Amino acid sequence: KKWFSEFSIMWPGQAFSLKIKKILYETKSKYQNVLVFESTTYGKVLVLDGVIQLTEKDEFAYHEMMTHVPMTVSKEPKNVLVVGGGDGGIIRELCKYKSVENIDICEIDETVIEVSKIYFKNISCGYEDKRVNVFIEDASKFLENVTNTYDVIIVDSSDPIGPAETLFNQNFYEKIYNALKPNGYCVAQCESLWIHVGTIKNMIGYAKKLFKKVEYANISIPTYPCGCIGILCCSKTDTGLTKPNKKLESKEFADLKYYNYENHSAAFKLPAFLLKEIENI
Amino acid sequence: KKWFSEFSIMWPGQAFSLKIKKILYETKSKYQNVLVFESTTYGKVLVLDGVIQLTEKDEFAYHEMMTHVPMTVSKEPKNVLVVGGGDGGIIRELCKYKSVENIDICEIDETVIEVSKIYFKNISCGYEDKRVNVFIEDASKFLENVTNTYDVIIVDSSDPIGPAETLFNQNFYEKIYNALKPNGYCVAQCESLWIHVGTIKNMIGYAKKLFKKVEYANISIPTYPCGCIGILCCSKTDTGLTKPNKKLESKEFADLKYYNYENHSAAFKLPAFLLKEIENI
Numbered sequence: 137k138k139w140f141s142e143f144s145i146m147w148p149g150q151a152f153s154l155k156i157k158k159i160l161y162e163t164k165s166k167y168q169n170v171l172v173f174e175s176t177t178y179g180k181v182l183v184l185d186g187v188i189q190l191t192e193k194d195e196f197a198y199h200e201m202m203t204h205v206p207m208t209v210s211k212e213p214k215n216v217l218v219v220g221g222g223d224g225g226i227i228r229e230l231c232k233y234k235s236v237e238n239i240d241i242c243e244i245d246e247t248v249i250e251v252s253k254i255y256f257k258n259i260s261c262g263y264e265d266k267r268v269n270v271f272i273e274d275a276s277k278f279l280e281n282v283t284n285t286y287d288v289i290i291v292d293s294s295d296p297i298g299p300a301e302t303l304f305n306q307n308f309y310e311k312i313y314n315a316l317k318p319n320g321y322c323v324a325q326c327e328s329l330w331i332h333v334g335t336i337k338n339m340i341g342y343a344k345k346l347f348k349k350v351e352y353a354n355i356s357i358p359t360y361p362c363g364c365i366g367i368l369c370c371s372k373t374d375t376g377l378t379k380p381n382k383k384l385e386s387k388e389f390a391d392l393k394y395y396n397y398e399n400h401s402a403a404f405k406l407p408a409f410l411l412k413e414i415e416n417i
Numbered sequence: 418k419k420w421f422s423e424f425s426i427m428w429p430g431q432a433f434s435l436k437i438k439k440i441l442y443e444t445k446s447k448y449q450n451v452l453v454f455e456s457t458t459y460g461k462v463l464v465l466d467g468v469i470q471l472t473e474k475d476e477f478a479y480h481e482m483m484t485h486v487p488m489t490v491s492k493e494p495k496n497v498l499v500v501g502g503g504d505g506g507i508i509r510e511l512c513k514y515k516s517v518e519n520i521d522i523c524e525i526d527e528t529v530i531e532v533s534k535i536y537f538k539n540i541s542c543g544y545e546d547k548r549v550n551v552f553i554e555d556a557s558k559f560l561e562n563v564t565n566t567y568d569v570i571i572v573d574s575s576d577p578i579g580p581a582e583t584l585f586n587q588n589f590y591e592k593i594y595n596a597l598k599p600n601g602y603c604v605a606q607c608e609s610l611w612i613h614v615g616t617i618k619n620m621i622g623y624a625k626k627l628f629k630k631v632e633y634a635n636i637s638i639p640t641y642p643c644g645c646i647g648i649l650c651c652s653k654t655d656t657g658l659t660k661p662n663k664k665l666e667s668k669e670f671a672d673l674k675y676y677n678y679e680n681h682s683a684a685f686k687l688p689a690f691l692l693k694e695i696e697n698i
């Protein structure tokens with residue numbers, strides 16, 4: 137049996153590898169290389185341009201935290217946007233909220249969605265929900281053109297190398313600010329505290345220009361580089377995203393595997409070296 | 418440049434790899450294979466029987482949490498024991514406490530200590546402290562024979578395969594119970610929540626037989642399998658280890674890089690799937 141190994145200039149000198157049970161699908165789309173394999177121990181794995189995007193084993197950790205953090209803080213969110221997230225994990229978690237009336241997803245690469253609908257049916261099940269509307273477009277353009285404003289924007293991008301290059305900058309955060317309701321929240325995938333501290337500082341810097349409350353949370357997920365990933369949390373009001381305003385008690389949330397009321401605030405309690413770095417920003 | 422790759426039956430189907438800048442030292446001791454290399458991005462790395470034991474880049478995360486969790490809860494600890502920990506990282510953190518009068522370390526493999534004193538001088542600096550007493554012995558035997566009792570016992574073992582095989586069982590926890598003061602605390606390296614849940618359940622089960630309060634905390638550290646490791650926290654009193662009884666404010670602790678007052682309790686806020694597994698124990 138062969139092994140898949142994740143190398144990158146974005147994390148030099150380290151690599152994570154998974155043993156391949158069988159390759160399921162491979163293609164070069166208009167935007168990126170796409171690879172799906174069944175691993176021996178992490179279940180099915182999606183790889184985009186050589187970078188692990190999700191595995192069946194741990195995906196719930198990232199999708200639950202990215203979704204339930206802003207969604208438990210927002211009082212009665214009705215319109216939510218997902219940027220990226222073609223796999224549909226975020227959308228799957230959003231559909232659990234009965235108050236939600238509309239979910240827009242803006243994904244540049246329709247191949248990602250189609251591959252997820254075929255190979256990852258427990259991740260892409262949300263696409264069946266009548267509230268979901270799909271836009272195949274660069275989020276950069278979608279955000280300049282959208283007429284609606286959103287209660288919550290979730291930025292579930294890949295890394296700065298590739299199609300997500302348009303999403304890591306100051307103009308992007310302006311567009312997010314403008315696409316949000318007066319009391320709206322954005323959460324965005326932000327890199328690992330263990331390797332990307334200069335980037336975290338940059339992103340916080342861009343966000344603080346516009347948002348009156350910028351916070352950073354960390355998630356444990358073994359198949360992302362360094363075994364964790366951050367959430368850049370941006371608020372328009374003074375109160376921020378560290379404290380949920382509700383508990384997820386109904387039957388739709390019985391099955392949650394990572395998120396809970398106490399984990400929410402705990403994820404914002406960062407290692408001392410990081411707080412030190414992001415103080416004079 | 419070549420790469421070091423960490424494979425193991427203890428974490429099947431996955432591997433973490435670091436690029437080697439240069440090999441520094443290699444030997445087969447009486448107990449295990451020892452390897453020291455300079456990595457390209459994680460600094461110097463100690464490997465025992467093919468398993469990464471520490472790197473310069475992230476070691477502080479494990480050593481600070483393992484030490485400062487029990488040491489901030491214990492009111493005035495005077496006598497502390499370290500089981501394993503031949504590198505001296507725990508001892509380095511213990512020496513910061515002026516109230517401490519004695520630190521015993523029981524390490525089976527003197528080669529580990531000697532290699533750390535040569536190659537890892539910023540980790541093994543604590544050995545110079547007059548309060549430190551070294552016993553080259555199986556902790557299993559040391560704990561049967563010791564006459565003193567300790568305020569805190571820190572079990573900084575390697576994995577269940579190798580010399581640390583004697584340290585993962587019910588009789589071991591009895592010996593820890595007996596070596597502790599009436600109001601004493603033990604913390605012990607416990608595996609990753611992402612792979613070893615049956616083991617975590619076993620260890621908690623053994624501990625709850627004897628200790629009136631057994632808790633589990635998680636630490637983020639990129640060079641351990643799955644990017645995290647747990648602390649099995651055992652207490653003889655009703656109150657447990659989740660809340661510090663002091664803040665580390667003096668000049669000795671100015672330099673801490675991971676631990677802080679709020680991180681302490683946050684580390685005990687576990688993902689929902691794990692709480693679910695460890696409820697009916």
Ligand SMILES: C[S@@H](CCCN)C[C@H]1O[C@@H](n2cnc3c(N)ncnc32)[C@H](O)[C@@H]1O
Nearest residue numbers: 220221222243244245248274275294299300
């Ligand atoms: C698969 S998802 C990663 C974790 C799964 N929740 C990353 C998605 O972001 C899309 N992406 C990347 N750049 C953009 C832009 N610019 N716009 C929209 N979507 C994008 C990319 O095609 C992946 O499908």
Ligand SMILES: C[S@@H](CCCN)C[C@H]1O[C@@H](n2cnc3c(N)ncnc32)[C@H](O)[C@@H]1O
Nearest residue numbers: 501502503524525526529555556575580581
């Ligand atoms: C290097 S340390 C790992 C992380 C660094 N704080 C693990 C040490 O535990 C020792 N060890 C393993 N088994 C035992 C027993 N049974 N007794 C004492 N020390 C042990 C082993 O030799 C390593 O040096």
